[PDB]
Amino acid sequence: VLRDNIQGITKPAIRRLARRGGVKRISGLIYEETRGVLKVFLENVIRDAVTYTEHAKRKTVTAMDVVYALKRQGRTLYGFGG
Amino acid sequence: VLRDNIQGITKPAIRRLARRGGVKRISGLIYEETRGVLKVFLENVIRDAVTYTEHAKRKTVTAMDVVYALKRQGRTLYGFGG
Amino acid sequence: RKESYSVYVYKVLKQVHPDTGISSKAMGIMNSFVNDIFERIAGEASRLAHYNKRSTITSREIQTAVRLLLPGELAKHAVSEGTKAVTKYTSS
Amino acid sequence: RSRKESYSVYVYKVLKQVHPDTGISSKAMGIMNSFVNDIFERIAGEASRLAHYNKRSTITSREIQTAVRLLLPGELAKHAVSEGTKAVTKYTSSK
Amino acid sequence: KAKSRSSRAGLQFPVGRVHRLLRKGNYAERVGAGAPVYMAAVLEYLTAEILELAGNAARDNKKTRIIPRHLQLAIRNDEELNKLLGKVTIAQGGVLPNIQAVLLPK
Amino acid sequence: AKAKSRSSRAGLQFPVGRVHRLLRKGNYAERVGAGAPVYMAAVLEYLTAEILELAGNAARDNKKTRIIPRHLQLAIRNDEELNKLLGKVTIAQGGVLPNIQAVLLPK
Amino acid sequence: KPHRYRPGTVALREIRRYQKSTELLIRKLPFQRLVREIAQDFKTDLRFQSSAVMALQEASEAYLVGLFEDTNLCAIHAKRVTIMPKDIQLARRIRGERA
Amino acid sequence: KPHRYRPGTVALREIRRYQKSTELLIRKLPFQRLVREIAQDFKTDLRFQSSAVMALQEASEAYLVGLFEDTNLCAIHAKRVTIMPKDIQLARRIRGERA
DNA sequence: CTTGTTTTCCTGCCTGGGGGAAAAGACCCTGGCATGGGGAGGAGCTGGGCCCCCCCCAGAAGGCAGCACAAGGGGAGGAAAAGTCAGCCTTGTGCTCGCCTACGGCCATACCACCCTGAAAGT
DNA sequence: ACTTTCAGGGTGGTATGGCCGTAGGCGAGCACAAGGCTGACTTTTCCTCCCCTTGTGCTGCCTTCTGGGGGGGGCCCAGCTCCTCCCCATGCCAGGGTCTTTTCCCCCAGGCAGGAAAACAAG
């Protein structure tokens, strides 16, 4: 998992997400744009979750850590506890 | 203070607000849309302010009531106490 | 051990939909909903007491927290529900 | 008339430290007081939520530091954490 | 003659556990006697309101069980519930089927 | 013993004792540690000094010797970190940043 | 014929002037009347602090100016320089006020 | 010659198919590797609960779908059906993620 | 590419008003003392997160055809911008009234705290 | 179905908050200019909108191959629990050092007149 895993978000996957979003046609640079946007979002959430994990003096990120990190960013998530 | 005071937000005032927003050209339908948007925003803030005032068993709405109403909507205001 | 509202969400489901069941995934979601609304109402009532320099959360602070947090017709029915409960609870 | 309280005195001392020859107006001082109260409330609420998440009863400098890390952006949080740690070290290890 | 307080208030939500949650939640120094009753009435009302619409959605799909999809359908179809839970993600809930009218063939 | 100020002991200007009292009476936890007020009063002093320095720079740029709300707003909206911290905050009588999109400028 | 400025340069001068200032761009009396008229529907025989009305006005000006900035960005997106109601609507829908 | 579909009908049927489902649209293993690669710059030797990675994936997918709806609105604003990186940029800026 | 024309910046002069210092006090912070309790630490246990193995088929990737959509150009019209002129209504000032709010004082009941037990809800 | 943890009953104490009284600050209300801002009309220009056309970039489809998903097994570390106890935080009281409110006056900001300079747009 060390290097260049952003390409694992394949163009078919991004098209599936866009289709769920109601998008009909997709330009070719959208895939790179989406990879960057998702990377920024994930960096924010995982930084907040790791902060909680480190404060709890744990070595394992729990689903509750992610739920708290999402709550403090304004995106509440139901279905993983809380 | 009883009827039709939304028209007191005049077209020159809306133009000045747009100019502070950096707008160069304004359509003639923008004024009656800005008035409705402002009306909705003021209704939302004043409802919460009056709810705070009634909870405090007061009859005069205070700057602190308004500040709490604005804070509750993610619109924290500096300068009028708090 | 751990606690939740599963016993009471189920007893509420059997009152509005006596035949319909609930998945453990849907029940776990309903538990996050109840905990999220409780912390919303209690947090607003906590601030309401602090603004007024009170040290007690009474039914008045819960009633005002409900009217601040819930939308129009949800608040009218939630307040009518809470008021009806306290009226019957205090009167025997 | 009941006496109110504010951060104006300490804001003024910090201002005379950072800019010895420039003043401040009453409205700017009110904004400074609102800012200090806002940040205090933010950090204290975050530390309270942290201590509740970890089933703790005491809000500690550890909770304050983790609230600061969760609330401030990169360089601001770095420098605020450093300032808080140095202040607590001076308080505990001297005088 | 040791009646429960939930039975005294006529509710199916736990007044005693709501009272304990309010007392140990660091919300104020004191908690009044009617506050847990009011809070447990509001929570019960909201839970019933959501479950009714979720069961309606489940019956709409000829399913006898409420699932996260049905909860999502109920929340997003109800205008007041959508406004209340406007910043909430329901896991495995999906989205409402919605296509912009410009994307449909002429 | 001659009462020694905890702010002086910590090295700060902000009121460590008043911060402790506000933490204790704010209903945040059952207990408040001894280092929590000292840490919070240091963070609040650092964040005050940052804004005050930037606003003093903004006042000097305008050839004023007294900070007014305009200077605080200019400091906040020109600092990347402070703008992010106070992104949902309205400064009364602070104005907006000078900014015109290139599309609207004359050709 | 007299001297006349081209359409759009006085607008730029006004943009510069109003972005250099901090004063309130809506007259205080009509805004106060609007605030009282709106509060009537929530509670009759209400009173207001001058500071309360001032806080409401400052909040409203900040809100409207930010909304106009987003509206201008939507107008430029649609390859226009004139802002239209649909630009305000798109801005509000994206920021989450229209859904 | 064989029969083929016109460009757009398959797009609409894919929209209809993926708007009726709830399953995650990203492959779980490459999403997990991405999450573990991002977390490596915050703390080395991090373990992850399977439910934690699942929660991250559900949050990320809901965020991307909600963003693509706003991107589609911005694309339609410019009299288009194809979404471009500038539509995403405008949507994120108006949302507040780019300011 | 010049010259006239509005508009804004700069500088000196006058002025006023609001902020920074001074003083009395009042109020809460600190020191000192006693004390229960929470959380840090040393074990012990086991649940699950990691890691490897094998298989397979479902999905991704690359290529090709073809088409439909984005974009640029051109032209018409209609709708803002700018300028001018008459009016009106905001605002700054001044005077009045009385209502509401905030404080004080007294006390009453409502909630905390604690000791026990039975039952509710968690596994 | 067992159980074991917690909600309910009864009692003591006091502290928070409710009620009556009171005073003044400030919010509402009324005149009264007057002049600066608004409303309206006119010109016309320039920006929006529509139509056409090109080519390029996107989609749809087909085939190959990879790698994600799904079991299967081992393991060892990390999270959780339990028991000690001790150091820290809490509660309380006495006394002064700090911070709040009032007073004032002098310098920094506001207003204005006059001149210089800087873009603008016509030719």
Residue numbers in the entry:
A (entry chain B), B (entry chain F): 21 to 102
C (entry chain H): 33 to 124
D (entry chain D): 31 to 125
E (entry chain G): 13 to 118
F (entry chain C): 12 to 118
G (entry chain E), H (entry chain A): 37 to 135
Quoted passage from the original study:
pmcThe specific interaction of proteins with the nucleosome is central to the regulation of chromatin function and dynamics. The tardigrade damage suppressor (Dsup) and vertebrate high-mobility group N (HMGN) proteins bind specifically to nucleosomes via a conserved motif whose structure has not been experimentally determined. Here we used cryo-EM to show that both proteins bind to the nucleosome acidic patch via analogous arginine anchors with one molecule bound to each face of the nucleosome. In addition, to study nucleosome structure in the context of active chromatin, we analyzed nucleosomes that were reconstituted with a promoter-containing DNA sequence from a Xenopus borealis somatic 5S rDNA gene.
